[PDB]
Design a protein around this ligand. Structure first.
Ligand SMILES: *[C@@H]1O[C@H](CO)[C@@H](O)[C@H](O)[C@H]1NC(C)=O
Ligand SMILES: *[C@@H]1O[C@H](CO)[C@@H](O)[C@H](O)[C@H]1NC(C)=O
Ligand SMILES: *[C@@H]1O[C@H](CO)[C@@H](O)[C@H](O)[C@H]1NC(C)=O
Lengths: 439, 439, 439
């Protein structure tokens, strides 16, 4: 098996029954486990029959459930322009009638059927003369201009942050007395002593690393999700998820959704005012950094519409087991180990890890190795046969060549890690898009 | 009483006095408490007189004090416009005199008494001809335009984030030997062994959940406060708290406070240039999400100008008690329980919790129940009589109907929870406001 | 020495060798240390020879390594303008040729050698008449306008956040049996039992405070660094680090770097269109809040291109030591203490702490003092001689005068702390800068 570190102590508990009291001696064992998909073994025994069956714990990690906050709905959108200009003393082009135009004024002046769709209106005044537009008097030309936004795809996008991530620890827990194997599954919570078959498990300690990726906009296209650069309700931060503000789901499907100016910077030409803006299709921002999103210490995955995020190595659960009328003793599994390296793969200085594949053999039950590169420090759990490991280190250069020294409970094993890593680009787009439909 | 989980161990400490040494045996007890406004009982005893008095601990939760960072002062503001236009060869409307106008140039051209108030100037050039404004020569008309900002209410608004929240644990701690009751109050800190009367308390462990709402703009209108979507010093992020940048308190009262363009998008008309902007009155953003602000795991409340934020259920303090020359033993309080449900209330997918009210009886000293709905998992502390509980679950749909199964140390108790939850809208306002005072 | 709080327990471990089993009794000791640059002593002994040598632990704190995410490159930049206007029926000033100008169109119309540098183009149309520009026909004057950006200094700026900060604990660990001193240095990790000479150290607990400054833009000018108000890839948030978006290092040196409009708000004059923008030189934002950046609970320092950040007081490591075939016992060091105060210094309500200097004497081996002001609570480790302490309290007013009561294991010591603190201003600049080079 593996090698954990433990403490054995005495627990004395007095139960209060109806007008009655019954005290109980016990033995209890606090074991400190780095979850790491280990195989943590234990041995039970009473004073009388020293063999009583082996116990096995396999923590699937330390996970955090999300507590959503649906903040911000949006849709694949395409912002378009429109304009219409008149001569003097015609339509609304007189003293102050075009000058008192309202922002949301749906004009009955060649505004197409899409007038209802959200947007903004504006009144400009260009030169008016017999060589400026072609009228007969030299009176300024009023220019009605209308921006709005169409959708593109019949879907909706739910943006949400996630405060108050809640702790949980699920463990595959098996027991082998003489012949059989129960291998139940348990859901431990930070103070709530669960009881699978006959033993009480409690989550006494958590040493999670401070990981501030847990506060960031998870976007959802129904079944699909991703992480994104934050955007906040009411600010219309351009060129990020949600330069369109749709508050309600029904407000999205019916498409009553506000956006802001400062996106499309219009410049006048007196015939076809040119408005250039960003062609925001959020699906891109999603594709920039989607889920699941593994990394060195954490990984953030959805499972039936709930964004769990767990950690493997940087943390160390601290568990407390009580065998009813027994006592527990761990098992230290001494064994050397051999290491088969590989070539690095992926990006350097990225939220993802510089990938690897370190096969390793144990000539014995699976044991743990505290791998130590130049700076970083990871762990692996290599066993008798094969058992590759993808471990996602975090170097920050292009060329990498270092002497990473694994260390199993036997003798350390030096080796070498080489590779050439490429830098990714998050993304970029400046204002180079425009589209107008004049009528 | 309740049921906590404990460890009893031996502590041997040798005190160094002046050229002297005195060692001491002891008994010590580490108990793991989910604060939850419990009533955690304990029983003291020496080898000689096994009754020595009961001890009672009632943790008020795990709280975080704030360490302010006053970043950003602002005021209820209303941005206004003004303009004045001239004919040719008059005032400053000649070769390049209007073209070299400075940004902060307080012009002596019909700029009212409010000229001193912050803002911006601009020089436009509209058509000039005998039908454009009414002058006699066909030379462009220079247009002086001035934006500025007035206050509305004689108050000030302090924006501040809060890094380095500090840990604290206050506990109501009572003792009952034979006749009386001391019920002191203690302030435990993460490593500093306090000593109330004759026993040493130390905060050995904290399992707080990762809660990234603790980094967000707390706004303060003196006695009142609230949480808000972040805004940063120097960016003038429109339509959020502080499109006005006031650095100093005295700089606010005297009102020397900068704001930026990109708020009011002006469009020319040669007589009354129309500038539309947001009517930012921060009191609104405050009313969007004020304090106190309870939720499922945490609540954030101010108490005498200090923003504490504590947690109840998601966490589990780990305490370490030492009775001087005694030993401690907990008490397990077996008792079944009955549950009286209620109807859900509030919002779904919101930082607030889907409210409930679960009365429950214990037929014995107050005990703990590990309530388990479909996904969520809360705890309650129901007792002999009445004792409602508001618990703020976190469902994420409109209709909700599930089989939540409470679980007391006796037998579990199935029941059903139904409700219809409504979605709230954070807020939204596009540029639909404008106000001008031409003279 | 100091006074720590401990637990002594029994550990029984059975090692599995090749087809062999060997069990081992032991003694183990879990000590709870607030790192605080203490001198935590310990005493070893077996049943036979009760003197076996003193042990000394000196934790350098609880530190967090950064796992970079290079997001955003930029450079000291200066944005400039340019323009050129023509008469009618000349160049590209006809029906719709200036009106179909592209955004990134490098025009062969007096666009200087710097045309290649990034920017934006625009076509305006001012009055055209015999008194508007001086042509002979009264046809509008097309105005070609070009914004771009030059660099200033031949350096590059790396912006990066830092998710998944990893835990580490380095400790100076010495031992003194009879004559000599080994004073090794150890690197403890959250679950990985290190072994310096003959004893196993493990990091069983961490009570770090929730500190949300650990998610903020660290900017780097090569050897220099600082903390800054966040900016995100693709949003071009004006007046903060990176209104220029340079994705790649090579893309910066060659200077192919995008920026956005909404910075320089141009206003037409038909000869010299005036464009005013912010003169962003990031070195300023760096100087606003540079590293190292000490505070009350944490400090964030770089050491060979790696941003460590450690904490001193608000936290309490929980360590677990095992002496091979011995047992450990702490030492309590009773001693009164004298305190020499000082005058406060620095800012109030700032991420930095209100500075102090509290000399203090111990008349014995260095001991610990739980200093308690009106609200705050710090700790110091004063010793026989001198030993100043800079402790960085966090008051939030200008005038401060309170009765801070130190408390050593002997009798408390009242004193008084006075001072006058000044408020700092983060920074501010509105649009008051412009520069044009017409040709
Ligand atoms: C492994 O590499 C380390 C470098 O840190 C070196 O100190 C050690 O001697 C090496 N072990 C070998 C070569 O067996
Ligand atoms: C309570 O509901 C659970 C569903 O999770 C079910 O398994 C159990 O049998 C129920 N108990 C009853 C009906 O007594
Ligand atoms: C020290 O000040 C405290 C105020 O909190 C007071 O209660 C105590 O009596 C003082 N001790 C003295 C004056 O010795």
């Amino acid at each position: 098996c593996s090698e954990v570190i433990s403490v054995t102590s005495t627990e004395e508990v007095c139960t209060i029954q109806e007008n009655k009291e019954t005290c109980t001696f016990n033995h209890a064992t606090t074991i400190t486990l780095q979850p790491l998909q280990q195989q943590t073994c234990l041995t039970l025994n009473d004073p009388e029959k020293r063999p009583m069956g082996m116990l096995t714990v396999k923590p699937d990690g330390i996970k955090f459930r999300c507590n959503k906050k649906i903040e911000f709905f949006t849709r694949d959108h395409q912002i378009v322009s429109e304009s219409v200009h008149r001569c003097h003393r015609a339509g609304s082009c007189h003293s102050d009638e075009c000058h008192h135009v309202k922002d949301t004024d749906a004009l009955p002046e060649f505004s197409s059927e899409a007038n209802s769709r959200p947007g903004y209106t504006s009144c400009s005044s260009s030169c008016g003369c017999i060589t400026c537009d072609g009228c007969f008097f030299c009176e300024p030309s009023c220019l009605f201009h209308r921006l709005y936004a169409i959708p593109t795809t019949p879907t909706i996008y739910s943006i949400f942050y996630c405060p108050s991530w809640e702790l949980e620890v699920d463990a595959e827990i098996s027991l082998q007395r003489e012949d059989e194997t129960t291998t139940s599954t348990i859901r431990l919570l930070p103070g709530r002593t669960s009881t699978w078959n006959n033993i009480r498990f409690s989550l006494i300690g958590t040493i999670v690393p401070q990981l501030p990726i847990l506060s960031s906009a998870f976007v959802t296209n129904g079944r699909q999700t991703s992480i994104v650069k934050p955007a906040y309700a009411g600010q219309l931060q351009s060129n990020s998820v949600g330069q369109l503000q749709c508050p309600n789901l029904e407000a999205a499907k019916q498409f009553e959704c506000h956006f802001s100016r400062n996106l499309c910077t219009c410049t006048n030409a007196l015939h076809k005012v040119s408005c250039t803006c960003y062609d925001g299709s959020v699906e891109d921002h999603m594709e920039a950094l989607p889920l699941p999103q593994t990394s060195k210490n954490f990984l953030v995955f959805e499972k039936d519409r709930n964004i769990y995020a767990k950690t493997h190595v940087g943390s160390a659960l601290q568990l407390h087991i009580v065998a009813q009328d027994l006592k527990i003793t761990t098992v230290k599994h001494t064994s050397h180990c051999q290491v088969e390296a590989s070539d690095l793969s992926g990006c350097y200085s990225c939220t993802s890890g510089a990938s690897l594949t370190l096969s390793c053999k144990s000539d014995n039950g699976e044991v743990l190795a505290n791998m130590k590169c130049n700076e970083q420090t990871h762990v692996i759990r290599c066993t008798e046969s094969g058992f590759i490991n993808n471990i996602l280190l975090m170097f920050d250069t292009s060329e990498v060549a270092a002497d990473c020294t694994a260390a199993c409970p036997g003798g350390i094993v030096n080796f070498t890690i080489k590779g050439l890593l490429a830098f990714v680009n998050e993304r970029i787009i400046s204002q180079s898009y425009s589209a107008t439909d004049v009528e």
